[PDB]
Amino acid sequence: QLKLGNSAIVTQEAANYCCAYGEWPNYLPTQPETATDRFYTLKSVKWETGSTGWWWKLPDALNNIGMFGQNVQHHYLYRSGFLIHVQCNATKFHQGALLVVAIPEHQRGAHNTNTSPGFDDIMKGEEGGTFNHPYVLDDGTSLACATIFPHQWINLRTNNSATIVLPWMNAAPMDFPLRHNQWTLAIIPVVPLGTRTTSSMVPITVSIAPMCCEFN
Amino acid sequence: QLKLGNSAIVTQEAANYCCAYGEWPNYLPTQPETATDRFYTLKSVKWETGSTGWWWKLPDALNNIGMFGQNVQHHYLYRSGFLIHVQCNATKFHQGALLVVAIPEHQRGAHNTNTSPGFDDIMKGEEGGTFNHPYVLDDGTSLACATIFPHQWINLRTNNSATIVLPWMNAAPMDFPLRHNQWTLAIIPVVPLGTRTTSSMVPITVSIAPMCCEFN
Amino acid sequence: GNISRYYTHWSGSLEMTFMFCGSFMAAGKLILCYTPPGGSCPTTRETAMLGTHIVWDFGLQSSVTLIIPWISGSTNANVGYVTCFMQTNLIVPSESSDTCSLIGFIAAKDDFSLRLMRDSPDIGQLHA
Amino acid sequence: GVSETLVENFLSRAALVSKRSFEYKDKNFFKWTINTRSFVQLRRKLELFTYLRFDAEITILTTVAVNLPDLTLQAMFVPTGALTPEKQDSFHWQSGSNASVFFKISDPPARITIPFMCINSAYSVFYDGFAGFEKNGLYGINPADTIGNLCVRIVNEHQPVGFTVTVRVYMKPKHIKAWAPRPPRTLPYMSIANANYKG
């Protein structure tokens, strides 16, 4: 049970949630404080034997759903931490691994061109984007070193959920929401799915919930 | 100064406000409590030498403006008192009287027909309606006995403001807002306006502010 | 204006003071409306009365101290609006002139902050 | 000494609220909706207050005239609730859930206390608004305000005499609690449903 505001997830084996960078979301010393604290559940993404990954930029992934879709497009500054729950239902007979990482300031880079990524290639909204080269995180870095960020492992042998608690990672005290994205939740299938007669989907559910919202 | 929520009136001679029926608005022993408590100022109505009067039904007069226009058309029950400020700017050289009365359950009646008043003739919205026979209050009663209701007098000799504080006048604990109207603020010019070379408008400003709002 | 062009990154909370300058009998109502940065400039009164406004009458109140909250401004950039809409029609007697006049007064508060002194673009190009 | 002017002392007069004669040989009985809107002597007194709350005391006085038997009468009060009869020998007269009352003409008159039947705290005498969400809904008729129906039939089977049975219903409200007084109406009424005026 994870009851925030009005709606909740009834999760069964609540795995050890990762407080990101050792911190925890808390208010700065207007504030709605109750309405926006709710689990905005995204769509279930089609994870197959040949999927490369998914990235949702926060808070661009929530600027179209509920009070937080309203409280962004009225206001001018937000300051809110996050709690991301990524739960991936699968039987015992499936195999595979996920790297559920929450990258701050994930400045992307286009392939084989010196042109900047456009507004259509960065801000996708709720739907999220697919990695084009997941080994290099689409910015020239390495996925092998990507555990330096806040990460958890969904190894479908061991567990099938990953909860990350993301704090306010910014130099500024309050930031414009539509023109900047701090965290980029990235789910990369390191070890891909595999089973013979049922090689189809194993869906992945992403449940982003803003915490400790402020607005001016 | 009458500062409610975010916006206010800077009124100059705050006359003796009439607590209606001796009571005062207070909560029942969801609640926003701060956003809807604000002075929704209606239009300034054209008061002339031959105007008969104006009636605004509450809360039909506010179901199209601000948070209270939103918090009605999402919810199902409201329970809120009212504070009506009627301020009528006029010089010393004008004359005239107003009866600023707040009639509860003002069931209107059409003239010279046995047909019920329709939805177009009762719910006017923010714009308010004009009396057709102000001597009988358009329901067969008498204006001469209409001081039994919560009333104040705007005599343009004496004062030029009238503040009424309206409580929750209902048998039910919470009521549907769109399909019922409790108070009917009625401004009747008992003694009409008069001046010779400037017989034109003396505008009347109505500033309704909900108090102690509840919603489910 | 002229001092905060000698400084690059300004901050703080300004405050306005409007003042009516008509005859004593002349009455009427304004609705001064503040729009936060990023808020749309209101065009009609019903949009404007939903902002953080004030309803000002020309009686004993011939001056309104309007406070503007923390802006921290610091390229055409815009960090707010103050639009004043006329609520009632202007009542003047037959003896006074029909045209009356408002004047404003901007003043910064004591939390106003200036830093990183640059030079002003005001004067720019003399005999003797 | 002003104790006669009390509000309970002002409205508790057993006035004739209903007077219907039904033949015997609405099919040969009467169904009367319990409301105050019938007689303007009592309607004007109760339309001085906005919210009323009262336990009614329905007294049915019944006298016979043959165009003289000893007849048995049933007076089934149907609430705002269950269905009402539509004929004289329907299955609704033999209902146990409805508070029927059986009496004869030769007895002293029938008397039952219908309690406060509204689901609000008081009867909205004047109501401003519509009942249902349809825009042609009835204006000023609160669905909570409805008392019910007082259905009276003759228990006897058909008799060889053809007679007219006169029923006079008296409603004396008691334990009256009143709220929010109103100006007394000057112009006459036009319909019992609403409050129009002729002019």
Q: Do the Cβ atoms of B130 and B54 come closer than 8 Å?
A: yes
CA distance D47 to D184: 7
DSSP letter assigned to residue B148: G
Residues of chain D neighbouring B21 (CB-CB closer than 8 A): 180
Of B107, B133, B144, the CB nearest to D126: B107
The C-alpha of C66 sits at a distance from chain B's nearest C-alpha, in angstroms, of 11
B136-139 long-range Cβ contacts below 8 angstroms, 24+ apart: B136/D186, B136/D187, B136/D197, B137/B103, B137/B106, B137/B186, B137/D183, B138/B108, B138/B109, B138/B111, B139/B106, B139/B107, B139/B108, B139/B109, B139/D185, B139/D195, B139/D197
The C-alpha of A115 sits at a distance from chain C's nearest C-alpha, in angstroms, of 23
DSSP string, B14-80: ----EEGGG-----------SSS-S-EEEEEE---TT---EEEETTGGGTTSTHHHHHHHH-S-B--
Nearest CA in chain C to A176: C38
Q: ∠ CA D49-D126-B19 to the nearest 5 degrees?
A: 60
Q: Do B89 and C27 touch (CB under 8 A)?
A: yes
**A10 contact partners, CB below 8 Å, separation of at least 6:** A1
CA distance D135 to B135: 29
Tokens of A20: 């990101």
Residues of chain D neighbouring B110 (CB-CB closer than 8 A): 196
Q: Do C88 and B6 touch (CB under 8 A)?
A: no
Residues of chain B neighbouring C59 (CB-CB closer than 8 A): 12-13, 89
Task: Please provide the CATH number assigned to the domain covering A1-216.
Answer: 2.60.120.20
Of B111, B148, B169, the CB nearest to D199: B111
CA A68 to each of CA A61, A71, A75, A76, B50: distance values in angstroms, whole numbers, following the listed order: 11, 5, 10, 13, 51
The C-alpha of B10 sits at a distance from chain C's nearest C-alpha, in angstroms, of 6
Nearest CA in chain B to C26: B91
Q: Do C91 and B13 touch (CB under 8 A)?
A: no
CA distance B13 to D84: 61
CA distance B76 to A3: 24
Amino acid at A118: G
Q: Does B108 touch chain D (CB under 8 A)?
A: yes
Amino acid at B113: T
Annotated resolution, angstroms: 3.8
Strands (E), chain D: 15-24, 30-33, 49-55, 58-66, 72-79, 102-104, 110-112, 123-124, 148-154, 163-171, 174-181
Chains D+A touching (3+ CB pairs under 8 Å): no
Q: Do C38 and A75 touch (CB under 8 A)?
A: yes
Of A77, A78, A80, the closest CA to residue A27 belongs to: A80
Q: Do C57 and B202 touch (CB under 8 A)?
A: no
CA distance D158 to D78: 25
Residues of chain C neighbouring B89 (CB-CB closer than 8 A): 27-29, 57-59, 88, 91
The C-alpha of C33 sits at a distance from chain B's nearest C-alpha, in angstroms, of 9
Residue ranges of domains in chain A: 1-216
CA B69 to each of CA B55, B61, B73, B160: distance values in angstroms, whole numbers, following the listed order: 19, 10, 7, 29
What domains can you pick out in chain D, each with its CATH number? 1-199 (2.60.120.20)
DSSP string, D15-54: EEEEEEEEEE---SSEEEE--S-S-HHHHHHHTTEEEEEE
Q: Do D195 and B109 touch (CB under 8 A)?
A: yes
End-to-end CA distance of chain C: 30
Of B159, B88, B99, the closest CA to residue B135 belongs to: B99
The C-alpha of C76 sits at a distance from chain B's nearest C-alpha, in angstroms, of 29
Nearest CA in chain B to C32: B7
CA distance D59 to D75: 11
Q: Do B9 and C54 touch (CB under 8 A)?
A: yes
